[PDB]
Design a binder for these strands. Structure first.
Ligand SMILES: [Zn+2]
Lengths: 49, 100, 97, 407, 48
DNA sequence: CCAGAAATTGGCACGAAAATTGCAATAAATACAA
DNA sequence: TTGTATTTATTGCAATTTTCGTGCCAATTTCTGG
């Protein structure tokens, strides 16, 4: 409720800046978790980190 | 379904619909004040489920009143004037009303 | 007793100082009510918050007063009850703040 | 042959029947597990609802602490239309105090029912109508007759009897009609004065429009899913490094290349199916749904040389945007009845005809199903009475005896 | 007259009843500030 | 005005037809080493 | 020049289940003529 989504006409539920930053962090974290699970080569996991 | 512009609004009284024509749009030359309806519009809310309460409501008061909302255009508070011009823009392929 | 329950949520906190420090990982985990695992916000089909997302009702609380997400418990008679299907507590929607 | 049916072809086929949102979820799930895949202030304002208005009126009313708690419980159990959704016993249980009887709850409920709007927090329709009628002055010409009808005989008023009502109430047509009109002048849903919400829309998957005298169908490019190969990770594929490191990249590159092709084939199949559907049902997009033709899956499955299963899977939960509106791309498949001489008439067209004929009837004597069948069997259609009754029930239209009016 | 939500409704009720007294309470923006500072990984709290 | 009939309505059934859903590891084109 | 390993291309059958229109008939609703 401190980072709400903006509803506008036509049903567009646009996102704010904080939600975008959180989404980027979560996407990178999930990809890194999967790569560490799958024992990826170090050259890729360093870039992901 | 689509939103409909019409004068057949169930929840409002007969007086508030006196300034609207057969198409649900205010007359030219009408003197309006804050809160008056300029364009009458309804938004659908229909759904398949019908409890006995809804059946009783539809039987007593009619089916038009149900499965519809009221999203009409109203004069903002503290605003008055005379209706001097109305313009209607319709998408291609949509049936035109009498006002257009 | 509903009178005490309603009286308790208007109480003001007493304090005389403000303390600032560094947050341990255990402190941060003790603050939280759950872990966010997915970058989803809104379902866009039922227009409900996605589970484990940034707006999850199981983590941050109900989207309506005293109602769980699925809809088994809905009134004040079930206040404070954690639903076994959706996991949402039956409480006020201001806890999302 | 029975194809080959690898565990990859199963996933490629399963992509057909997923809606765009579920497809995006699947694409994200496959994206976070394959490194070589990739994809190409405001605060708001507080709104006052019905419950907020009711609680604002509760705060400014001289209630005691117990009465205020009971009022909070009552206002909590009030839906958007203004009706009480729980019995008073549930409210008494939720209070949690054992020295309170049902009489105090009844008194607090009576006090709340006189808030603005009047009739709110009503138990049922009879209670709401009686509450609204108790605020009228005694000078109303037909107050007593309407009150009697609402209090005693409302079920047979809903049944549209209008004749047994005359016998029991001992009135005349010119008085019973006035009482009925007075009743119908009341407000059925008190809580809809404060409307809060927003209509919910959908994103169409395919758009059909009219260009230079013909119909053009194309995918909606604002929602079409598309993936891409990550070149940075693909570059370090066969370079000098560990053999395991080089083998980890080839497999993922193969998987990504296959997934991109599966997405492209899904889009192409959807476009071809939609194009064939628009070509077949061409009169609908011009002259409304009274001219829809009765096509089935096997009709499309021969115009694109696919199997009926593929057509069934593609058309699932995908929406088409037309100047008339938004449909589900399966709304165009319907049953049929035999017409006169030769041909078939779709059930959608017959439903539209039935709705039109019912909407233009005499209010004094509504059209029964036999009369509707006779009227339909003049244009050529051969539909049975039971089928017409089924269509009317599907349209949510009451029977003939429940559509008549005293006018 | 501001972001203190409970005092807002108490003051209106007191004024309508003819009692010109207030119970101040805590502003909401301070709670928002505390939450935003905590979201940065800093432990800030009220004591006693 | 009162039976008795005639009409109306909707639940259940039937056989055809339509629609849905589970399969799980192949065949040919192509670059390539002898 | 030729047998061989790799990469594409494959998006249909065959069960099983659901839905279809329309008939039979009991239970309500209206009509009529004595
Ligand atoms: Zn629940």
């Amino acid at each position: 409720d401190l980072r709400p989504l903006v509803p506008l006409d036509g049903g567009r539920f646009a996102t704010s800046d904080l939600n975008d930053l959180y989404r980027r962090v979560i996407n990178r974290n999930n990809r890194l978790k999967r790569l560490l699970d799958l024992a990826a080569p170090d050259i890729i996991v360093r870039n992901e980190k | 379904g689509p939103e409909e512009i019409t004068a057949d609004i169930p929840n409002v009284g007969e007086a508030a619909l006196s300034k609207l024509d057969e198409s649900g749009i205010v007359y030219i030359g009408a003197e309006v004040t804050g809160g008056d309806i300029l364009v009458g519009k309804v938004t659908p809310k229909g759904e398949t489920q019908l409890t006995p309460e809804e059946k009783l409501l539809r039987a007593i008061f009619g089916e038009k009143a149900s499965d519809v909302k009221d999203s009409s255009l109203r004069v903002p508070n503290g605003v008055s004037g005379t209706v001097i011009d109305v313009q209607v823009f319709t998408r291609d392929g949509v049936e035109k009303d009498k006002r257009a | 007793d509903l009178l005490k329950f309603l009286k308790a949520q208007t109480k003001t906190e007493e304090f005389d100082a403000i303390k600032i420090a560094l947050a341990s990982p255990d402190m941060i985990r003790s603050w939280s009510f759950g872990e966010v695992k997915k970058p989803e916000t809104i379902n866009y089909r039922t227009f409900k918050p996605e589970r484990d997302g940034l707006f999850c009702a199981r983590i941050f609380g109900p989207v309506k007063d005293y109602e769980c997400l699925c809809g088994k418990y809905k009134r004040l008679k079930h206040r404070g009850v954690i639903c076994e299907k959706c996991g949402v507590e039956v409480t006020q929607t201001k806890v999302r703040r | 042959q029975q194809l080959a049916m690898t565990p990859q072809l199963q996933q490629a086929i399963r992509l057909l029947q997923l809606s765009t949102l579920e497809l995006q979820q699947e694409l994200q799930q496959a994206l976070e597990s394959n490194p070589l895949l990739e994809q190409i202030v405001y605060q708001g304002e507080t709104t006052q609802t019905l419950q907020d208005y009711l609680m604002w009126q509760v705060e400014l009313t001289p209630f005691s602490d117990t009465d205020r708690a009971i009022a909070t419980s009552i206002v909590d159990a009030v839906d958007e239309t203004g009706y009480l959704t729980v019995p008073l016993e549930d409210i008494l249980e939720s209070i949690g105090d054992e020295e309170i009887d049902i009489d105090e709850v009844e008194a607090v409920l009576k006090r709340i029912q006189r808030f603005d709007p009047v009739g709110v927090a009503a138990k049922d329709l009879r209670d709401c109508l009686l509450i609204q009628l108790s605020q009228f002055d005694k000078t109303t010409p037909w107050l007593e007759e309407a009150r009697l009808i609402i209090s005693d005989h409302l079920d047979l008023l809903a049944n549209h009897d209008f004749r047994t009502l005359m016998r029991v109430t001992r009135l005349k047509e010119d008085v019973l009609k006035e009482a009925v009109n007075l009743i119908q002048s009341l407000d059925p849903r008190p809580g809809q004065s404060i409307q809060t919400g927003e209509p919910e829309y959908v994103i169409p998957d395919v758009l059909v429009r009219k260009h230079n005298g013909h119909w053009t169908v194309e995918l909606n490019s604002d929602s079409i899913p598309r993936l891409q190969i990550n070149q940075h990770y693909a570059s370090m594929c066969n370079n000098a490094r560990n053999d395991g490191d080089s083998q980890f990249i080839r497999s993922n590159l193969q998987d990504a290349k296959w997934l991109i092709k599966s997405l492209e084939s899904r889009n192409d199949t959807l476009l071809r199916v939609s194009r064939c559907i628009v070509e077949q049902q061409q009169a609908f997009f011009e002259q409304g749904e009274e001219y829809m033709k009765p096509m089935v899956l096997a009709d499309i499955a021969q115009a694109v040389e696919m199997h009926e299963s593929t057509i069934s899977r593609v058309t699932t939960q995908k929406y088409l945007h037309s100047p008339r509106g938004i449909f589900e791309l399966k709304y165009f498949f319907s049953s049929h009845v035999n017409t006169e001489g030769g041909g078939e008439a779709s059930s959608t067209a017959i439903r539209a005809l039935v709705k039109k004929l019912i909407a233009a009837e005499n209010p004094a004597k509504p059209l029964s199903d036999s009369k509707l069948t006779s009227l339909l069997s003049e244009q050529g259609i051969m539909v049975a009475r039971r089928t017409v009754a089924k269509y009317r029930e599907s349209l949510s239209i009451p029977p003939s005896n429940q559509r008549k009016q005293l006018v | 007259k501001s972001d203190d939500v409970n005092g807002r409704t108490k003051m209106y009720k007191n004024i309508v009843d003819g009692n010109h007294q207030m119970e101040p309470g805590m502003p909401e923006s301070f709670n928002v500030l505390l939450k935003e500072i905590r979201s940065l990984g800093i432990n800030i709290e009220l004591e006693d």
